């Protein structure tokens, strides 16, 4: 049976449907981190032109179909769609179709054969981000504490300047 080519063949296949894909910008590059699959993708902040993908008509259809189903299933009662879908070319050869959300409150892409490089990025970021947040609070608390002790040393010196001066002077 004969059928048209463009709507029958694709050069990209839908891999994963992420419900929560947080996008952040730091170091001059967007970082799409998914907490569900524990993966982090890096891009160049420039929307990869979908027209550049050879035989990629199935990608506007597949991406929009998943977005509509996911939005109505979970984000209809709490979030709102902002703009149209955005396609970004991530490091390693992964094309990410992104749909920003807000709270009510010609060539062929070569995909790498291992996503473990991205999983390590998420794991390191998931351990570095909090540990640094807790290293930052401890440092802040220590400084606030030291400034608090000065109120006691200013009075302890009068009681016995010999002992206070000895430990402070060295």
């Amino acid at each position, epitope marked *: 049976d004969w059928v048209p080519k463009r709507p029958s063949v694709c050069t990209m296949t839908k891999w994963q449907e992420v419900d929560e894909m947080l996008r952040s910008e730091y170091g001059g590059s967007f970082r799409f981190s998914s907490d569900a699959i524990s993966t982090t993708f890096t891009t160049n902040l420039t929307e990869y032109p979908l027209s550049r993908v050879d035989l990629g008509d199935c990608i506007g259809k597949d991406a929009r179909d998943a*977005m509509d189903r996911i939005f109505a299933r979970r984000y*209809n009662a709490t979030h*709102i*769609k*902002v*703009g*149209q879908p*955005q396609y970004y070319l991530a490091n390693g050869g992964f094309l990410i179709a992104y749909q*920003p959300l*807000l709270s009510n409150t010609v060539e062929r892409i070569k995909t790498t054969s291992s996503i473990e490089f991205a999983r390590l990025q998420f794991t390191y970021n998931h351990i570095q981000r909090p540990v640094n947040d807790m290293l930052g609070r401890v440092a802040i608390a220590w400084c606030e504490e030291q400034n608090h002790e000065l109120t006691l040393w200013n009075e302890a010196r009068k009681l016995n300047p010999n002992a206070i001066a000895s430990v402070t002077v060295g």
Partner: antibody
Amino acid sequence: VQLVETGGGVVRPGRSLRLSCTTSGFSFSGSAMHWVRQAPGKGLEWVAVISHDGNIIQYHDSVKGRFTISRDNSKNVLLLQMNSLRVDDTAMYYCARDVWLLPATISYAFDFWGQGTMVTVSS
Amino acid sequence: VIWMTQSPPSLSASIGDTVTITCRASQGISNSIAWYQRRPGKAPELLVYAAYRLQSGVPSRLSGSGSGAEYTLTIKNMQPEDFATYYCQQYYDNPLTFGGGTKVEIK
């Protein structure tokens, strides 16, 4: 907020015309701009869009390849260079800013509209 | 191109009554749709976004609803300043298309 458009007038078919839209009251560099037309006694129709920084441009199938949208963030002025005009292009052109909901996304909706100017194609 | 069918093209209402304007698209657009208002002699002004988000400063008595390819805009208490042309525009896929428009007038 205030939006003003300049460059309208009567032009012969197949000729070029360039419109300009001045802005004030909002961060022009932080919001995308859109162009809308209103034919006499007809409905509204979108023309084109220019991102906040102008990196991406999108046009309507009825004006793709004929029009040319551009912006100058330094002078906070929007422009739409028109070429190869046709009789069907006779309409009131309005310049409108997108709805700011997120920092760099394009809402593809209109929140502020200008006074509009006429562009009549006659011979 | 996603055609936008808006009806009724024209209807009349009295001050202090309920009205409902229906807008239909040629294909399912989830919730990507906006509503506008254009008073005589003035430029249009946005009212609702994504079929449910009311714009800042818009009266709370005016609200929209619907899903898929069916959408509606309702006003529970008409005021003299509400009589104007209302347009429904979609942004699910390019090119952006507006509705036929419905002119609410005094009856």
